[PDB]
Amino acid sequence: GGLSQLVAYGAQDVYLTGNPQITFFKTVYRRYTNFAIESIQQTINGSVGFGNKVSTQISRNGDLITDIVVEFVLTKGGNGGTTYYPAEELLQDVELEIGGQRIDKHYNDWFRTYDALFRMNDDRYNYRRMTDWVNNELVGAQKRFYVPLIFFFNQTPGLALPLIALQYHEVKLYFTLASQVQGVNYNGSSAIAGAAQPTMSVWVDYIFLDTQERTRFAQLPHEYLIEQLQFTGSETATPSATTQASQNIRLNFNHPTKYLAWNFNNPTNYGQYTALANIPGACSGAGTAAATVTTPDYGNTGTYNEQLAVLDSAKIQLNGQDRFATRKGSYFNKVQPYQSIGGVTPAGVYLYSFALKPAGRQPSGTCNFSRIDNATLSLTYKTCSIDATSPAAVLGNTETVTANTATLLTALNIYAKNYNVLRIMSGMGGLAYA
Amino acid sequence: GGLSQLVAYGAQDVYLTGNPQITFFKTVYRRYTNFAIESIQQTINGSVGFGNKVSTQISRNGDLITDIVVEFVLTKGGNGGTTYYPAEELLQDVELEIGGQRIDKHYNDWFRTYDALFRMNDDRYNYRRMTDWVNNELVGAQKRFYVPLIFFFNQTPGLALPLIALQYHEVKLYFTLASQVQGVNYNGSSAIAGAAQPTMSVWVDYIFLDTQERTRFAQLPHEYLIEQLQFTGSETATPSATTQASQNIRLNFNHPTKYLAWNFNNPTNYGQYTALANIPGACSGAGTAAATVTTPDYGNTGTYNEQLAVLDSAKIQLNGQDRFATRKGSYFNKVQPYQSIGGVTPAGVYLYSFALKPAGRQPSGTCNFSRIDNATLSLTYKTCSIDATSPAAVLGNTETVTANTATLLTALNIYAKNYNVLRIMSGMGGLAYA
Amino acid sequence: GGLSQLVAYGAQDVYLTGNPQITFFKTVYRRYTNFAIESIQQTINGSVGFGNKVSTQISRNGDLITDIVVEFVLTKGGNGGTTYYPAEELLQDVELEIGGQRIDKHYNDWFRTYDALFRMNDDRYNYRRMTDWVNNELVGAQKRFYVPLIFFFNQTPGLALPLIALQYHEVKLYFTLASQVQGVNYNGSSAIAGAAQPTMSVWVDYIFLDTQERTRFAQLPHEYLIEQLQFTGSETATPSATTQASQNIRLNFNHPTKYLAWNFNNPTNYGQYTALANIPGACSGAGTAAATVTTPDYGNTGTYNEQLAVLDSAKIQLNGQDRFATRKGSYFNKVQPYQSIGGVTPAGVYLYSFALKPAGRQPSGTCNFSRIDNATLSLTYKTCSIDATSPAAVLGNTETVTANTATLLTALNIYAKNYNVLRIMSGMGGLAYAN
Amino acid sequence: VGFGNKVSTQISRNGDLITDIVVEFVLTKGGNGGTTYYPAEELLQDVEL
Amino acid sequence: FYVPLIFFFNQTPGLALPLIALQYHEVKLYFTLASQVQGVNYNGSSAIAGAAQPTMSVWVDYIFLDTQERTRFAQLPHEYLIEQLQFTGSETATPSA
Amino acid sequence: ATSPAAVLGNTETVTANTATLLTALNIYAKNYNVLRIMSGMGGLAYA
Amino acid sequence: PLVDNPFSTYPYKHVITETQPTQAKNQAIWGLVQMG
């Protein structure tokens, strides 16, 4: 029985159980402060509608804030398969400002990129359920969507923003709503007659602190090591059926960077990071007579089909020196996520981490671009000679080629997630570094 | 290369690497008390069978106990698609008693609710494999099921029950077996002629300690922070096709609570937390001419499609005051789990946490219901006007409505998980608070 | 609102928040040593090709090493559905050598068994994406595969191998490539005409330490607690329609062990741990006239249907004594990993843990086989009476029976994952324990 | 109690020391003479102390 | 039927198990009953229709000691030399014609 | 085995063709150990 | 921890002060209800 194993003891056990330090059969729980959480609706100023800019000022109902969820009500302008994360698309961007200072700013594409790299398993599925229609809903269906924000204070209570310690500074969220959302008010370039304007509401989760903790937050200075997103849009050295396009992109980045992330995309179709093709999930009508490689199956815009991705290879140069040996696009798409995050990244989305664990909150190695005169991302594209309308050509091809619909992925989005210091003192706050 | 990153050092990095305290590249593992684990079968008193009660005393074979699995052998009384988590359904409830004191109790519905909220990804899939037939098994098939228990000591080594320190008190498990199990001995209300009675066995995983640790457990007092389930069943306000029914349920709960959870269900059909409809998986024969929207596709009983959920909105009141602003049923179903657990919750199952992390062992904010003279859960139901037999109506509808078949969701189960302390001393013990 | 809860403080809150020790709203991150990670391509000696053995010396391109990823380029020799983790199958094994001493070794089957037990969810899927063709690719398709290694230093920075502290020892990786890979150069036993030889490249991720940290690593002695794989292949007592075959296998294992793992398989078909059958995915052509239960649907080689698994029940005997009561094979397939790992294990793969958390690095309980002179794995097989070509028989059967085709699972692989100590001193290193 | 069942007994303190133990079984013949062989012994598949 | 057990204490009073000296330990006998018994519920491989399930009763013969012997057993430590049975099953290297 | 002449008139080194039905082998060993009883509890001296 | 509540901790107080066989060392009796 179990005793027959305990008796099997000797020298090789000393390293494991001699002079024991711990047990596994008794947990010490740590007494904590007294607090409560409440979801409080914010007032949104400005007219809500497609393409409009609206904003909200966070109220002082509680002492600290964490989670923020933006609610939207959208309706279907067509049947299942016509939308793709439409609430994520709708929230074109969100800017976080404290005391008039920009702390951070996210874009719909960032939310898509972030999700592609950092969410997973049922978290990812539940996420999709909060931003899209995933049960084959039909035209006219109404749904409330919830878009969680991903600012540093929205990911951990550990970085809760001490609004209580910001007595003289207002905190605002500026939101841009997309001019168009696929399958909601537009179908490709065509407007959808009768489309409703979205209903919007912003909820902020407030932490109510008891007397001793509340007093300390209100009076003491604070420093937080927080995350920021750096982002610029670039034009892609568009692939050609005749050759391997190449490009050297100066990266206007600064600060200790945890990771870079990027994608190539068709700016017309939100979330399209791959070339279209006549294979079952790669285009509108794929597999039948009506198939076209000019329009995606929006409900299946994202894919793991690497052959439709357009990056052959890439490397990052620092001041002219390769930071690492050139690796294939597939490294950045499949391996980096394996090595550092543990989820699965869809084709067309790439990651390169400078951190051991980029998905966490503890710094684990950074590349400080504020000390790098010239940071450049070098890209080599695949030859776009594959006839996208022919599965034999799409599915039986080689490593270095892609579909001719790859020429549509003309946009390149390069992101860098970095660490800065948020300092709150004597009722004011903002960041230490520019 | 890598060296060119290390040199890119500046003021911004002081908060990450100035005055280094730790490294990432050298781990010292903690030495621990030597132990062994043995899985030992208990003798079941009473009589195993449908509708019968059985019980067992946990033998003092080892020193501490953790994991417990109840095994069942069930046979299929019909084909694939006729059962739904039948081993979970069969084990109607389990009561944990120490020295005659009730410590805790779980219910088949709780196991289902718990699962819906806290298990996830492949943990959830494997769980389903251990309680159901998921490979399209056919009538007459026989299978060994394993139902892990979910008492506080069955979740972590950290709460191992110090059976050795409880000499004066027996530890017993009482198990109620359901009178009927769908697809095993009954098909809806109809008994299945020739159905087999279940075979049952209870296994306990025992921890064998070394000399020094064993002695300390036997002689020292122990205080284990544990979690308990509180539960009562309620009738729902009759959902109606004519209006939005509402209900105010007194929250007859006590103790610091990590979270409340609830579901609405059809008491006839185990696991049915939503309405049925003529859309694939939403009823027997759904999607075709033979569809019956009053009979579920048992193998696909649950769903993530809220359109079939019955709760429009809800709030919790404490002493008549709002705890938080009214939020939609979809908030409790999708967002609370996102924000606090990270999994995906099936439609019809709702969660409201008071804890930052309700899925963990460590307390992180609680609602003390022993200090709320009159807590109430306020529920607003959807209008049940949708013709369940017409996919156009079922799938193209609005946020505030549901299926006419949602009026069958007459039962409501409200659960709460709280924190108590199990104290053991001088060979005896029990919970510190009632 | 939140305040009406906050204010309702009482006696039962004292054990949670009285004399508070921690908060959740002020995380202070630890300061750490500065470092950087760089991917370096290794030079592989020996011709890479099917059946060849090649090797590389880990280059001296940094101070510590962690991840190792082997890249391969394979070309489909047939259509979608004809391959199963072919890059995993291709890498037959990898042997880790330090100072000329064998430290560890992994096998293609182990990679499959390991994955079956320890990877999960989207990690498992992404893993599959890096070793197989998962988009219904067609013949002639070319893909680069990435097969990460699973040596102790490839799992955590904490066990990075200190090449910097091994100034006098070479560290080498020996790679054996399979003579055949299903759906790439062979289809069952038949060679595929025109099949290409694989391209291969080995990548090692190097850690560049700062000056103070590097110096300490270079000069100080180190002791690492590391995980090794023990493995031998055995003959499965032939399963049969007429009876319940049984077998007692003496286990030639040593060292503190976190867990045992095993599988039964058809050695012809990589990854086949279950019987073939005419049910969807269980054989080539299953569900139609061409269904043949002599060949698997390679793209769906594995399954979660225990009815096709051979093992009925098992126990482990130590020094002649039962270590635990005999449990069903399904207990070792589904419960063990539920309780100890948290993922899902496919049919035909079994686990028995001696550890509370076998998937981790912390030695949370071990069985020391160096103190167990007579360790035996005792196996009882199911009766192979079910006609694999008839779904009614395949799917409607009883707990103690399986497919007639389960008789083909003639190979048994038994693994043990144990803990040893890798000591490094004065520029050299090796293991503390031989047996 | 039944065929294939697993049962157990705890010996209570009904005296000071224990010696002989006899397990009684009541069985019927499912066929004629010549069909059984020490069936109560066969029935007692095992016993663990 | 009366099946005697053959554990060491079931063969001689000399090894009578002193239950009163075991104030903290239970003594249990676990039994496995055969799924089939020849000529009772099965005839070779064939089940016998209508076969009855067994009735079971376990009888233990106790020794009652007078005061001095009783006291010594409860109080004194004891060392019983006892028998144990070791057993494993094997596959027979089945002979052939 | 079906022919008494063959069954009963045979040699030392041979047996019945039906003897191949005896496919299971049971090996037992009876040994000594010591059952110690002290302070209300007991057990065997050797593993 | 453990603020001494008087109405909530009454059954736990009844279980802790309940009599148990805490004096059965070397005492030979025919009782002993499976004491641990």
State how far the Cα of A407 lies from the Cα of A402, in Å rounded to an integer.
10
Gap from G4 CA to chain B (nearest CA, Å)? 9
- Name the residue of chain G whose CA is nearest to C18's CA: G1
Q: Coil, strand, or helix at residue A15?
A: helix
In chain G, residues with a C-beta closer than 8 Å to the C-beta of F40 are 24-26
Contact map slice: F 28-47 vs G, CB within 8 A: 39-40
Q: What is the count of residue pairs from C and E with beta carbons less than 8 Å apart?
A: 10
Residues near A178 by beta carbon (within 8 Å), at least 6 away in sequence: A50, A51, A89, A90, A91, A92, A108
The CB density around residue A326, as the number of other CB atoms within 10 Å, is 15
The secondary element (H helix, E strand) that includes residue A337 is helix A336-340
Gap from B374 CA to chain C (nearest CA, Å)? 12
- Name the residue of chain A whose CA is nearest to C209's CA: A365
State how far the Cα of B113 lies from the Cα of A164, in Å rounded to an integer.
38
Structure tokens at A74: 């959208």
Q: Quote the DSSP letter at residue A404.
A: G
State how far the Cα of A221 lies from the Cα of A345, in Å rounded to an integer.
40
Helices C121-129 and A121-131: crossing angle, nearest 10°? 100
Distances (CA, A) of F42 to E14, E61, G26: 17, 20, 13
State how far the Cα of C418 lies from the Cα of C257, in Å rounded to an integer.
4
Q: Where are the beta strands (DSSP E) in C210-310?
A: 222-235, 246-250, 256-265
Q: Coil, strand, or helix at residue A149?
A: coil
Gap from C13 CA to chain G (nearest CA, Å)? 9
In chain F, residues with a C-beta closer than 8 Å to the C-beta of A4 are 47
CB contact under 8 A, D10 and G28: no
> Do B197 and B50 contact (CB within 8 A), yes or no?
yes
Strand order in the sheet with F41-44: E78-91, F24-38, F41-44
Residue with token string 């890979």: C181
- Name the residue of chain G whose CA is nearest to C12's CA: G3
**Are there at least 3 beta-carbon pairs closer than 8 Å between E and A?**
no
- Name the residue of chain D whose CA is nearest to G28's CA: D16
Residues near C2 by beta carbon (within 8 Å), at least 6 away in sequence: A36, A37, A38, A61, A62, A206, A207, A208, B323, B324
Helix spans in B220-334 (H): 329-330
Query: What b-and-e string marks burial along E32-71, b requiring 16 or more CB atoms within 10 Å of the CB?
Result: bbbebbbbbbbbeeeebeebeebebebebebbebeeeebe
Strand partners, A105: A95
CB contact under 8 A, G24 and F39: no
- Total number of residues shown for chain E: 97
State how far the Cα of A407 lies from the Cα of A242, in Å rounded to an integer.
12
State how far the Cα of A139 lies from the Cα of A68, in Å rounded to an integer.
29
- Total number of residues shown for chain D: 49
- Name the residue of chain E whose CA is nearest to D22's CA: E4
Q: Where are the beta strands (DSSP E) in chain G?
A: none
Gap from G12 CA to chain B (nearest CA, Å)? 5
Q: Quote the DSSP letter at residue B374.
A: T
Distance of CA A424 to the CA centre of its chain: 27
Residue with token string 């009855």: E52
> Do B48 and B175 contact (CB within 8 A), yes or no?
no
**Are there at least 3 beta-carbon pairs closer than 8 Å between C and B?**
yes
> Do A198 and A49 contact (CB within 8 A), yes or no?
yes
Helices B121-129 and A121-131: crossing angle, nearest 10°? 110
The secondary element (H helix, E strand) that includes residue C127 is helix C121-129
Note whether A8 contacts C: Cβ–Cβ < 8 A: yes
Distances (CA, A) of E60 to A418, D15, D16, D47, E32: 77, 10, 12, 14, 18
Contact map slice: B 141-170 vs A, CB within 8 A: 156-160
State how far the Cα of A361 lies from the Cα of A227, in Å rounded to an integer.
8
State how far the Cα of A61 lies from the Cα of G7, in Å rounded to an integer.
36
Mutate to test the interface with D, among G30, G32, G33, G35 (most CBs of D within 10 A): G30
In chain G, residues with a C-beta closer than 8 Å to the C-beta of B431 are 12
Cβ burial, residue A49 (10 Å; 0-12/13-18/19+): middle
- Name the residue of chain B whose CA is nearest to G21's CA: B168
Note whether E90 contacts C: Cβ–Cβ < 8 A: yes
CB contact under 8 A, F40 and E18: no
State how far the Cα of B132 lies from the Cα of B296, in Å rounded to an integer.
16
Which of B163, B167, B433 shows the shortest C-beta gap to G9? B433
Gap from A126 CA to chain F (nearest CA, Å)? 54
CB contact under 8 A, D7 and B43: yes
Structure tokens at D20: 């002989």
CB contact under 8 A, C23 and A399: no
Note whether F14 contacts E: Cβ–Cβ < 8 A: no
Sign of CA dihedral B205, B210, B216, B219: positive
State how far the Cα of A175 lies from the Cα of A198, in Å rounded to an integer.
13
- Name the residue of chain C whose CA is nearest to A308's CA: C135
Note whether A354 contacts C: Cβ–Cβ < 8 A: yes
Experimentally determined by: cryo-EM
Closest of B262, B306, B340, B326 to residue A129, by C-alpha: B306
Residues near A100 by beta carbon (within 8 Å), at least 6 away in sequence: A169
> Do C173 and C94 contact (CB within 8 A), yes or no?
yes
DSSP assignments along B87-133, one per residue = HHHHEEEEEEEETTEEEEEEEHHHHHHHHHHH--HHHHHHHHHTTS-
Helices C121-129 and B121-129: crossing angle, nearest 10°? 100
Three-class HEC string of C392-418: HHHHCCCCCEEEHHHHHCCEEEEEEEE
